[PDB]
Amino acid sequence: EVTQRELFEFVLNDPLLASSLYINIALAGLSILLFVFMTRGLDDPRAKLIAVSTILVPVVSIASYTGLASGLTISVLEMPAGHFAEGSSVMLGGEEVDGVVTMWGRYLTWALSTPMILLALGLLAGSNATKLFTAITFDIAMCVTGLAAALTTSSHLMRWFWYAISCACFIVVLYILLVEWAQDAKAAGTADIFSTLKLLTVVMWLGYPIVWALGVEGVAVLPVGYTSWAYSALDIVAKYIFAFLLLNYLTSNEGVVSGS
Amino acid sequence: EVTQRELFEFVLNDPLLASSLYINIALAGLSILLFVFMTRGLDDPRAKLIAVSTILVPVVSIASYTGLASGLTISVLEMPAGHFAEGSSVMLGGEEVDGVVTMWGRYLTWALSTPMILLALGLLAGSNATKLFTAITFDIAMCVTGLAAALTTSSHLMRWFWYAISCACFIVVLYILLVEWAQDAKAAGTADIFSTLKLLTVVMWLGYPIVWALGVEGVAVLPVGYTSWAYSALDIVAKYIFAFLLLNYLTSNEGVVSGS
Amino acid sequence: EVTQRELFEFVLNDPLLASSLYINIALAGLSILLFVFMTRGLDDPRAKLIAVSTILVPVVSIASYTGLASGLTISVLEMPAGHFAEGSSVMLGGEEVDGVVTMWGRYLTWALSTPMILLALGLLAGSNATKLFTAITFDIAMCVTGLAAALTTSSHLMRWFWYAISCACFIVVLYILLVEWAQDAKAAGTADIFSTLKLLTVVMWLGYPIVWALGVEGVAVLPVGYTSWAYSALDIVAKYIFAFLLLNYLTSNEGVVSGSI
Numbered sequence: 150e151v152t153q154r155e156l157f158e159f160v161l162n163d164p165l166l167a168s169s170l171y172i173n174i175a176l177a178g179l180s181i182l183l184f185v186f187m188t189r190g191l192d193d194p195r196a197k198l199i200a201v202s203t204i205l206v207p208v209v210s211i212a213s214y215t216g217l218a219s220g221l222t223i224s225v226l227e228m229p230a231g232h233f234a235e236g237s238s239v240m241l242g243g244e245e246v247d248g249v250v251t252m253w254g255r256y257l258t259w260a261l262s263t264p265m266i267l268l269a270l271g272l273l274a275g276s277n278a279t280k281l282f283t284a285i286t287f288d289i290a291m292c293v294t295g296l297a298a299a300l301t302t303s304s305h306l307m308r309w310f311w312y313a314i315s316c317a318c319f320i321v322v323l324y325i326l327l328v329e330w331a332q333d334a335k336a337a338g339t340a341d342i343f344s345t346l347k348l349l350t351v352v353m354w355l356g357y358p359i360v361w362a363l364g365v366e367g368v369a370v371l372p373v374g375y376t377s378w379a380y381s382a383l384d385i386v387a388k389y390i391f392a393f394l395l396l397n398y399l400t401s402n403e404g405v406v407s408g409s
Numbered sequence: 410e411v412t413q414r415e416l417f418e419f420v421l422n423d424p425l426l427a428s429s430l431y432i433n434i435a436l437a438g439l440s441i442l443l444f445v446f447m448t449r450g451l452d453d454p455r456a457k458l459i460a461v462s463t464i465l466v467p468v469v470s471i472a473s474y475t476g477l478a479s480g481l482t483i484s485v486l487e488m489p490a491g492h493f494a495e496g497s498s499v500m501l502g503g504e505e506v507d508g509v510v511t512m513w514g515r516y517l518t519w520a521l522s523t524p525m526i527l528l529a530l531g532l533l534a535g536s537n538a539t540k541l542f543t544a545i546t547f548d549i550a551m552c553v554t555g556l557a558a559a560l561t562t563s564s565h566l567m568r569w570f571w572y573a574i575s576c577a578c579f580i581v582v583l584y585i586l587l588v589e590w591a592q593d594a595k596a597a598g599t600a601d602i603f604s605t606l607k608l609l610t611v612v613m614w615l616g617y618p619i620v621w622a623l624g625v626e627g628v629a630v631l632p633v634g635y636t637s638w639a640y641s642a643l644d645i646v647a648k649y650i651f652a653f654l655l656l657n658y659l660t661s662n663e664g665v666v667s668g669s
Numbered sequence: 670e671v672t673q674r675e676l677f678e679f680v681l682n683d684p685l686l687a688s689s690l691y692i693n694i695a696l697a698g699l700s701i702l703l704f705v706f707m708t709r710g711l712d713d714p715r716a717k718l719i720a721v722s723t724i725l726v727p728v729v730s731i732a733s734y735t736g737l738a739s740g741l742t743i744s745v746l747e748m749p750a751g752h753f754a755e756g757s758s759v760m761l762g763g764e765e766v767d768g769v770v771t772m773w774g775r776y777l778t779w780a781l782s783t784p785m786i787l788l789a790l791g792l793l794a795g796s797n798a799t800k801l802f803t804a805i806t807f808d809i810a811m812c813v814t815g816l817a818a819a820l821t822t823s824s825h826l827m828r829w830f831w832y833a834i835s836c837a838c839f840i841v842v843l844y845i846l847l848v849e850w851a852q853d854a855k856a857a858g859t860a861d862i863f864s865t866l867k868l869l870t871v872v873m874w875l876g877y878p879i880v881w882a883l884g885v886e887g888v889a890v891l892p893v894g895y896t897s898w899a900y901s902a903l904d905i906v907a908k909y910i911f912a913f914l915l916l917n918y919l920t921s922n923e924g925v926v927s928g929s930i
């Protein structure tokens with residue numbers, strides 16, 4: 150029975166963990182201010198939709214990272230027989246506790262933020278509703294199944310079956326980004342900025358399942374602290390700079406996206 | 410350790426607490442039967458959409474209040490060091506239990522009912538998709554971060570940080586109600602009814618973050634039973650009477666709200 | 670003190686229970702491959718929306734059934750006084766545990782998939798946004814209040830009160846399916862197929878609250894393993910075959926539903 154307080158103190162006293170988390174909370178807040186200021190000029194409703202959708206990314210990120218830092222969305226789980234992190238221990242409170250400190254809260258960051266990124270990119274590319282619906286539903290399925298994998302402690306094999314379903318959903322999102330929206334952006338007159346954001350999104354997103362497989366959730370070659378910093382670095386690019394690049398464009402081309 | 414039945418019994422056997430819960434269950438139930446009856450004559454689809462979104466308010470309310478009354482959405486939390494309610498006891502059942510009875514279920518009632526209130530009001534004001542999206546998203550963020558605040562026990566200051574984040578989201582919603590949709594109602598031809606509903610909402614909505622701060626979750630000047638009734642009083646106005654007013658107007662201005 | 674592993678193992682070792690779960694994981698997966706293959710030639714965006722909504726049904730189902738088989742969305746609950754399943758035991762890990770193995774994960778399978786079934790049927794019927802919004806919101810309310818009913822252990826009466834609220838939400842869905850969309854399909858040119866799929870849906874959907882009342886969650890004439898197969902059988906028809914029938918039509922009549930999103 151680990152308390153939220155003990156997990157909160159655990160993040161603290163842990164150099165890599167505390168920094169990877171609190172640094173994103175600060176970068177998330179600064180992004181919001183920068184983005185709100187960068188977009189005060191917008192007037193086109195559609196251009197503003199792309200703007201707000203994008204601003205929600207760091208908004209979800211600051212709130213979600215606070216969920217982790219606070220200890221609210223953190224748990225200690227025991228990995229099943231065969232798992233490379235099975236048998237691990239953690240010092241919480243005044244005793245050694247079996248298990249791994251699991252930052253499941255990240256999956257909430259992803260479930261709520263990724264759809265916004267997709268909504269922004271889809272609108273930017275001039276996507277019809279079918280593709281937006283397809284990309285977003287499967288993106289959500291990808292995040293939720295990823296969370297289920299991280300939460301499964303009954304069977305090592307089951308954790309990886311979850312991982313495989315999540316990857317299949319990932320592929321659907323990738324196909325829309327790489328093939329469908331790439332084409333739609335041409336008709337939208339945003340093919341250039343879309344290619345840039347598209348490349349950045351694909352490379353960064355491909356990084357998450359890699360970190361998962363290598364971190365404590367996977368084969369654990371990366372300690373709980375390094376797994377967290379890997380994710381945090383990826384978020385900075387996939388979220389904060391991605392958002393800046395998109396907004397930097399929008400604010401100079403409000404006329405191009407001003408449609409229906 | 411505390412069972413659901415023990416919380417269910419705690420609510421009963423306590424006139425204040427129970428009355429603030431079972432009364433809203435009955436009032437909600439009656440409001441549904443009344444709202445459905447009231448709108449049975451509607452024929453326009455857009456008008457019908459506003460009525461259903463409004464009818465969902467008391468639907469979500471009766472379900473959520475049942476969640477609280479049954480003990481399903483209630484928990485016992487120990488406040489952090491420095492919290493005005495630290496070191497409290499409850500006596501769940503017949504044993505003295507440390508902590509405070511936390512009715513976190515109210516937040517779900519809010520995260521699900523407020524978007525419906527906003528959707529109805531936005532449509533009534535002739536709002537475009539951009540503003541509805543902005544209003545609803547930040548509103549949900551408001552409710553979720555508010556829930557996170559109540560559920561945080563690791564730090565006293567963390568709770569207020571959540572509270573601060575939620576207030577920021579609250580201001581975004583308020584701005585759209587007061588400034589944005591105020592102008593939209595004009596062109597939509599519902600400027601006069603929106604005024605009454607706008608005021609009512611902004612005044613009633615301001616009561617929640619105030620009650621929070623004064624109740625057990627906040628500085629704790631109001632006992633658990635008084636906070637409950639404070640919220641229930643607010644729910645009765647911001648939901649039932651507010652919904653009756655909106656519906657009464659809608660049924661009288663179906664033609665106007667339909668557009669063409 | 671019941672762990673996810675103990676529940677995972679309880680399912681395994683229980684022939685009825687393991688089969689009701691793993692068979693659907695397999696049929697859901699085969700359904701997805703079959704459905705993606707069937708709809709490969711679609712081009713119209715409205716036709717494709719109907720296809721994706723339908724395909725999402727077995728996608729949700731495979732994930733959620735894995736949730737159940739893994740033990741992630743299963744818990745042990747003790748029924749309230751007067752409940753026909755009160756005082757039951759389950760034997761987990763090694764000792765006897767009071768309560769009933771509660772597969773609440775099924776409600777998540779429902780709350781996420783039923784909306785897709787409705788979206789697909791609504792579009793097939795040429796429904797306007799109002800009825801679609803009304804059908805989907807009350808359907809979700811139906812699934813959520815149902816989950817609350819199963820999760821309620823404090824009062825036997827409260828359990829059935831949640832059940833009644835859920836039924837009322839169900840009546841809204843049924844009304845839209847039987848009265849509203851039945852007429853819209855005529856104007857959409859999809860009466861024949863819609864009426865068929867609507868009827869198949871209504872009959873199967875009616876099966877769920879009946880199983881709930883007869884199963885371990887209700888009067889318990891059906892033990893845990895049997896209530897599970899009752900639900901798994903309903904799912905096979907209401908999801909996999911229903912979706913297969915709907916896609917069979919879609920892929921031979923793209924032009925009829927082509928219209929515009």
Ligand SMILES: CCCCCCCCCO[C@@H]1O[C@H](CO)[C@@H](O)[C@H](O)[C@H]1O
Pocket residue numbers: 414417418750823824826827830
């Ligand atoms: C309109 C829906 C409102 C639901 C009202 C439910 C109230 C039922 C209370 O029942 C009683 O609860 C006590 C405490 O658990 C038991 O000791 C007692 O034996 C049982 O009879």
Ligand SMILES: CCCCCCCCCO[C@@H]1O[C@H](CO)[C@@H](O)[C@H](O)[C@H]1O
Pocket residue numbers: 304306307310677678681694
């Ligand atoms: C389609 C989804 C595929 C998942 C199939 C899950 C079945 C794997 C069961 O594994 C076995 O479970 C036993 C009891 O827990 C262990 O004693 C044993 O060592 C382990 O190997």
Ligand SMILES: CCCCCCCCCO[C@@H]1O[C@H](CO)[C@@H](O)[C@H](O)[C@H]1O
Pocket residue numbers: 749750751752825826829
């Ligand atoms: C068409 C659906 C009909 C639903 C009928 C539900 C009735 C369930 C009543 O339960 C009983 O209520 C008593 C008084 O509250 C408790 O003392 C007792 O312990 C409890 O078991």
Ligand SMILES: CCCCCCCCCO[C@@H]1O[C@H](CO)[C@@H](O)[C@H](O)[C@H]1O
Pocket residue numbers: 751752753882888
């Ligand atoms: C649609 C399905 C119909 C729901 C039927 C549920 C009613 C359950 C009745 O149970 C009985 O209630 C008595 C109190 O009233 C208890 O004294 C008795 O021990 C208990 O067995």
Ligand SMILES: *C/C=C(C)/C=C/C=C(C)/C=C/C1=C(C)CCCC1(C)C
Pocket residue numbers: 258259262263266291292294295296298311312315316319354355357358361384387388
């Ligand atoms: C702000 C967060 C972003 C952009 C997150 C992106 C996350 C993914 C692309 C995650 C994908 C995963 C899989 C495909 C497999 C299983 C594990 C996950 C959840 C890490």
Ligand SMILES: *C/C=C(C)/C=C/C=C(C)/C=C/C1=C(C)CCCC1(C)C
Pocket residue numbers: 518519522523551552554555556558571572575576579614615617618621644647648
């Ligand atoms: C039916 C329910 C209604 C109209 C609820 C409204 C709720 C609010 C305006 C809540 C606001 C809050 C904050 C601004 C700060 C933190 C705590 C909350 C959640 C009480």
Ligand SMILES: *C/C=C(C)/C=C/C=C(C)/C=C/C1=C(C)CCCC1(C)C
Pocket residue numbers: 778779782783811812814815816818831832833835836839874875877878881904907908
């Ligand atoms: C894929 C799943 C399907 C088609 C599920 C359908 C479920 C229902 C129609 C459930 C209805 C219920 C009630 C009306 C009352 C309370 C209990 C439920 C949840 C079983």
